[PDB]
PDB file of C-alpha atoms (C1' of nucleotides) in Angstrom:
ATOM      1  CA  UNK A   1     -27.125  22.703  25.413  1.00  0.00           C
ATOM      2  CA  UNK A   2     -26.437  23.156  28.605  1.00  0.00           C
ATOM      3  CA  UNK A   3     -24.105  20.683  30.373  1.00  0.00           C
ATOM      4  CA  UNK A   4     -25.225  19.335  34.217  1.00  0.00           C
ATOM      5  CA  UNK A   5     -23.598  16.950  36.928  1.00  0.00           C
ATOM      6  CA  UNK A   6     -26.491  14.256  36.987  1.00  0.00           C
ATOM      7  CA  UNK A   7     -26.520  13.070  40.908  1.00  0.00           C
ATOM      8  CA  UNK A   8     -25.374  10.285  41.694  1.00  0.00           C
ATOM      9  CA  UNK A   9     -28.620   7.998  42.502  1.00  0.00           C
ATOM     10  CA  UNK A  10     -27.876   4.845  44.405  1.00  0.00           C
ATOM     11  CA  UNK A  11     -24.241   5.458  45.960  1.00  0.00           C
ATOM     12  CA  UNK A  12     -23.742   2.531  48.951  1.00  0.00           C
ATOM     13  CA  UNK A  13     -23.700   2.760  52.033  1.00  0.00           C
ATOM     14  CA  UNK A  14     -20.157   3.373  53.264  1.00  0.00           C
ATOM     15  CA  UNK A  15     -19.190   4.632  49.652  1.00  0.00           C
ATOM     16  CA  UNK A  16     -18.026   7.846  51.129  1.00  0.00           C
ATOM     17  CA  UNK A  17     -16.708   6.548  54.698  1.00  0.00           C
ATOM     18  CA  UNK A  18     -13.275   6.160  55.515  1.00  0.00           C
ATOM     19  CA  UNK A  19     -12.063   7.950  51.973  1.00  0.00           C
ATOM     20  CA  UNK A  20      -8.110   7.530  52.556  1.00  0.00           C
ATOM     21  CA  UNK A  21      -8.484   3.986  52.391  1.00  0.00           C
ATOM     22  CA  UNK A  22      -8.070   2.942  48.460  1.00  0.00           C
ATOM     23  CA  UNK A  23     -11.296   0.868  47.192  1.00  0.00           C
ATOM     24  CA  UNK A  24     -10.978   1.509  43.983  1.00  0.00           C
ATOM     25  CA  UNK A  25      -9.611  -1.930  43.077  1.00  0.00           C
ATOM     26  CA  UNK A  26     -13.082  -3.496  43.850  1.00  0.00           C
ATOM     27  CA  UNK A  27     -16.625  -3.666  43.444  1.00  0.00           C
ATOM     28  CA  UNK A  28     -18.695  -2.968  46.566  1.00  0.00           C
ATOM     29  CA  UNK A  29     -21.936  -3.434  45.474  1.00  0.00           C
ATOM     30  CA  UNK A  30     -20.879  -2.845  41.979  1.00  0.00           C
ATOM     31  CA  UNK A  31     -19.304   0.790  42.715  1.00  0.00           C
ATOM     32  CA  UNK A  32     -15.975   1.024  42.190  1.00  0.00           C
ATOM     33  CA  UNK A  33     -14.873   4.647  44.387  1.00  0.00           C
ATOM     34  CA  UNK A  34     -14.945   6.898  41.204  1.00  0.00           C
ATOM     35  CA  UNK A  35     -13.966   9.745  43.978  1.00  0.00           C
ATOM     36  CA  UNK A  36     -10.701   8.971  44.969  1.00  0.00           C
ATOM     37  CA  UNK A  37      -7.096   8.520  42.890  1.00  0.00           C
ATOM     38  CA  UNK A  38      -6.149   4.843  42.672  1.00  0.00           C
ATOM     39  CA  UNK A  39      -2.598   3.543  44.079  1.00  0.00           C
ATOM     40  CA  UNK A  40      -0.135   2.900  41.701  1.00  0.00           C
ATOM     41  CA  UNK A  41       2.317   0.269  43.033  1.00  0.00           C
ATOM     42  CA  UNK A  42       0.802   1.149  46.570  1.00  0.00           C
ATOM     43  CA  UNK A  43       1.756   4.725  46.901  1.00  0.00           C
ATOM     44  CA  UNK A  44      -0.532   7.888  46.619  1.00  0.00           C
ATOM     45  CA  UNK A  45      -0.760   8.977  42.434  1.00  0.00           C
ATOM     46  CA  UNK A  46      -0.510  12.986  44.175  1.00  0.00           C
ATOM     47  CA  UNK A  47       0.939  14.864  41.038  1.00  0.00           C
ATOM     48  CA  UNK A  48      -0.661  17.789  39.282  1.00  0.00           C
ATOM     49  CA  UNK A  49      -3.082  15.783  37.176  1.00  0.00           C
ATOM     50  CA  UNK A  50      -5.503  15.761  40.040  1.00  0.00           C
ATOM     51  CA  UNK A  51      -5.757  17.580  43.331  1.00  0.00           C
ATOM     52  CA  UNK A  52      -5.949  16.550  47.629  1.00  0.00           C
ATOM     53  CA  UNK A  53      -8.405  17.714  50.064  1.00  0.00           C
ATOM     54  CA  UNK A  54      -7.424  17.585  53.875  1.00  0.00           C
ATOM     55  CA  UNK A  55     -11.513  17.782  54.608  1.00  0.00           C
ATOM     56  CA  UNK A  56     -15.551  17.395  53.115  1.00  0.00           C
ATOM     57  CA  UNK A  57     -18.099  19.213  54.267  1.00  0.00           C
ATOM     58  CA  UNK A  58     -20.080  15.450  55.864  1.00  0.00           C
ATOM     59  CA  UNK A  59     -23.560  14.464  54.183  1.00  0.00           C
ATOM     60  CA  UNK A  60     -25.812  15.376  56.061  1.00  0.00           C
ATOM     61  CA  UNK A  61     -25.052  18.583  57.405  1.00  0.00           C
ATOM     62  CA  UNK A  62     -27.377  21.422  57.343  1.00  0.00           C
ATOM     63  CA  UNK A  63     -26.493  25.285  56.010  1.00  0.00           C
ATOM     64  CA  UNK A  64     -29.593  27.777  56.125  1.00  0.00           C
ATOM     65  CA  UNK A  65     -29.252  30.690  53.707  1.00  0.00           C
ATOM     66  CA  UNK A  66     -31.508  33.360  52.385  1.00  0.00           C
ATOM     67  CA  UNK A  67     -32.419  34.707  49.239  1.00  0.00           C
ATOM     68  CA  UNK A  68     -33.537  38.235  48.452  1.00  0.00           C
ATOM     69  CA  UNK A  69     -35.567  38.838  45.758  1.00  0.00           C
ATOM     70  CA  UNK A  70     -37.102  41.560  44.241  1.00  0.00           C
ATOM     71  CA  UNK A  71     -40.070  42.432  41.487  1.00  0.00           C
ATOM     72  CA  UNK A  72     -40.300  39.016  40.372  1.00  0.00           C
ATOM     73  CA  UNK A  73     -42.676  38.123  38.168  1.00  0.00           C
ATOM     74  CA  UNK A  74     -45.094  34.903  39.025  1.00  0.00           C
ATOM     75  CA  UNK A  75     -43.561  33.113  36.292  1.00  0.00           C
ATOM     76  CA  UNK A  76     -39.949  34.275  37.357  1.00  0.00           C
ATOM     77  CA  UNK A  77     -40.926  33.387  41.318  1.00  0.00           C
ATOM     78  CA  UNK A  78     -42.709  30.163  39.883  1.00  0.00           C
ATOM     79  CA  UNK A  79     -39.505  28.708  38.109  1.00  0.00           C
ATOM     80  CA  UNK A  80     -37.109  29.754  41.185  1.00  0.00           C
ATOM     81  CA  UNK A  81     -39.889  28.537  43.879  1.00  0.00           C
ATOM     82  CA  UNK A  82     -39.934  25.126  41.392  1.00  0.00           C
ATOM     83  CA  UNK A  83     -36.126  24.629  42.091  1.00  0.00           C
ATOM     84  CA  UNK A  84     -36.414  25.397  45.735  1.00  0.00           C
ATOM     85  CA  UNK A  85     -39.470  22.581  46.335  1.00  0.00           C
ATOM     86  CA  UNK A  86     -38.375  19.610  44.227  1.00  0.00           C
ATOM     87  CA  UNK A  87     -39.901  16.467  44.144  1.00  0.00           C
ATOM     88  CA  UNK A  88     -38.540  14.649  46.522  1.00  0.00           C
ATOM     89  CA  UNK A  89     -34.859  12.489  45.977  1.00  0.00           C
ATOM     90  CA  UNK A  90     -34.093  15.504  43.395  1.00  0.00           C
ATOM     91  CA  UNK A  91     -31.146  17.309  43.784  1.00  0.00           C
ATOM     92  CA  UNK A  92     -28.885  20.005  42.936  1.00  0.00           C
ATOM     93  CA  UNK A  93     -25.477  19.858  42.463  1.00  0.00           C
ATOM     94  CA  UNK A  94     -23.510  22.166  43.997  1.00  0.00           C
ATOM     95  CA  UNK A  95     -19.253  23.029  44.103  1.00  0.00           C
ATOM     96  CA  UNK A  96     -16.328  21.327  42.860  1.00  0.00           C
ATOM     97  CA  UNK A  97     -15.912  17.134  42.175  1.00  0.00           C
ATOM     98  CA  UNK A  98     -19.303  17.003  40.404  1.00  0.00           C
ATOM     99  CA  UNK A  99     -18.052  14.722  38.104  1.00  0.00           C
ATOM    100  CA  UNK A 100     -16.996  12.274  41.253  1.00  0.00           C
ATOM    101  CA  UNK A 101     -20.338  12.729  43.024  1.00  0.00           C
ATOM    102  CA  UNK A 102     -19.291  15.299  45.432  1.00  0.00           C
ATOM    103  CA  UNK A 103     -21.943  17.859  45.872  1.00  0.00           C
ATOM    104  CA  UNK A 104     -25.326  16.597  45.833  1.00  0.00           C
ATOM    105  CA  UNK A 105     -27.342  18.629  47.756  1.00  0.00           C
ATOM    106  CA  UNK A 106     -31.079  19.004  48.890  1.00  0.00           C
ATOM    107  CA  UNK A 107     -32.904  22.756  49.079  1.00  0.00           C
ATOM    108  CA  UNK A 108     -36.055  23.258  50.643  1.00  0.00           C
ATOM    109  CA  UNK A 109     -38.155  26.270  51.556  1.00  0.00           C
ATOM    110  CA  UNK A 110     -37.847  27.054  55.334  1.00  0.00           C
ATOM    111  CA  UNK A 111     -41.720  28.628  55.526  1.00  0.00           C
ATOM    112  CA  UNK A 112     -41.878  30.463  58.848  1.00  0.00           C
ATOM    113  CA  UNK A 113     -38.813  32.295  57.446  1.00  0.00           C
ATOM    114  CA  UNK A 114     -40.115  33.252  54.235  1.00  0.00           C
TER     115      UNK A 114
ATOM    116  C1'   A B   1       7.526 136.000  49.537  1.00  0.00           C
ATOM    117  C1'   C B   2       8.251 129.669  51.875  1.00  0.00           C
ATOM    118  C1'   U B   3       6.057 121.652  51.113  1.00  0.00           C
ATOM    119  C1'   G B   4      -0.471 121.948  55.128  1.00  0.00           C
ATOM    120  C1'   A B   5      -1.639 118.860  59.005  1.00  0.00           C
ATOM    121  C1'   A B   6      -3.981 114.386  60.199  1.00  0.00           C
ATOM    122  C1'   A B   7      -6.937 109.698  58.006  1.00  0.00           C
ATOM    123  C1'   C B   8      -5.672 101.114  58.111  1.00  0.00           C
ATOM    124  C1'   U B   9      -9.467 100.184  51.453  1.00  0.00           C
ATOM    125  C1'   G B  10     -11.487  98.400  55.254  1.00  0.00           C
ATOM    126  C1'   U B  11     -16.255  96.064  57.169  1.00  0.00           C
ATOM    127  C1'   A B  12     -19.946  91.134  56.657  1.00  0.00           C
ATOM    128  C1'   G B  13     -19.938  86.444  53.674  1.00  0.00           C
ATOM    129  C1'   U B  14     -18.035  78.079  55.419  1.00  0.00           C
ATOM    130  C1'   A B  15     -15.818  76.604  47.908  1.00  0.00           C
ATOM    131  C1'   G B  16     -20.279  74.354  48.839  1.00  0.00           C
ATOM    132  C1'   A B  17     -25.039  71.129  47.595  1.00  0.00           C
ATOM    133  C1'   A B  18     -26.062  66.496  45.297  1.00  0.00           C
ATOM    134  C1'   C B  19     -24.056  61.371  43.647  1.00  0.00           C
ATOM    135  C1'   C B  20     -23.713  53.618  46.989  1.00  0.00           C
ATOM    136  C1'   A B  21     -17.234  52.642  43.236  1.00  0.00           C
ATOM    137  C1'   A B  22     -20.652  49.852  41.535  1.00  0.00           C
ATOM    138  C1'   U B  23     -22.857  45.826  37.920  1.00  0.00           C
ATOM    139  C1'   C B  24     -22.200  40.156  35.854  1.00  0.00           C
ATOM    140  C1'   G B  25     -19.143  35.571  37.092  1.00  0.00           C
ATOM    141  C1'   G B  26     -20.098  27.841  41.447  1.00  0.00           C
ATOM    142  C1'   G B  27     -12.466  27.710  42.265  1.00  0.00           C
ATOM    143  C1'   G B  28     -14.295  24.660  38.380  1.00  0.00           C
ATOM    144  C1'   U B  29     -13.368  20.049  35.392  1.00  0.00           C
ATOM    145  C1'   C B  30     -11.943  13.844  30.992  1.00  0.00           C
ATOM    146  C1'   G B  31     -10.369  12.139  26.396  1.00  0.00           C
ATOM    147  C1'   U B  32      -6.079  10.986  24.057  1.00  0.00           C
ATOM    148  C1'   C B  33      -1.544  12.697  22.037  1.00  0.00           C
ATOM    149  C1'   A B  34       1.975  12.421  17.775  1.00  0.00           C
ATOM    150  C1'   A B  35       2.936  11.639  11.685  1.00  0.00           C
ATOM    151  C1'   U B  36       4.893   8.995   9.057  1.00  0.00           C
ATOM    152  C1'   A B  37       6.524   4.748   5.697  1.00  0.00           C
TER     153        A B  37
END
RNA sequence: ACUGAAACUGUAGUAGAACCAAUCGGGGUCGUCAAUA
């Protein structure tokens, strides 16, 4: 079928803080800091299996956009106003490092706007 | 068995009307590899 990023429930706290440091020797809280690129011998594995980022985008932070649509039907509107008022604690998963959690994001209808 | 003369092919008329250079696409992501003895 088709393949999807399930999010990453139950992530602890501090899992994402301070990334440079390497964790990934060690359970915290039974996580191990599938994100980052262990050491090997104590210096950065940067070669062109994997990639760097200088920067995230922080959880937490809030984008607004809009979405234009025209002649939907109510079962076309239906399915697209489903994904855009969840249940809550479900998410989408959105740009690149899926696989490593990044990405998780929440969408809600902004009313006053619509 | 005495050359006619003289007379601007000019005058008026917009190569233009209409037509979206555009439609679809997350800069994304995990299992080996190799063939002999």
């Amino acid at each position: 079928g088709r393949k999807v990023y399930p999010h990453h429930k139950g992530l602890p706290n501090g899992y994402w803080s301070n990334p440079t440091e390497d964790r990934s020797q060690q359970a915290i809280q039974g996580h191990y800091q599938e994100y980052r690129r262990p050491k090997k011998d104590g210096l950065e594995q940067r070669d062109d299996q994997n990639r760097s980022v200088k920067g995230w985008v922080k959880p937490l932070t809030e984008f607004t956009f809009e979405i234009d649509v025209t002649n939907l039907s109510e079962v076309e509107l239906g399915a697209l106003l489903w994904l855009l008022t969840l249940p809550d604690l479900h998410f989408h998963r959105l740009g690149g490092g899926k696989p490593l959690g990044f990405g998780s994001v929440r969408l809600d209808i902004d009313p006053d706007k619509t």
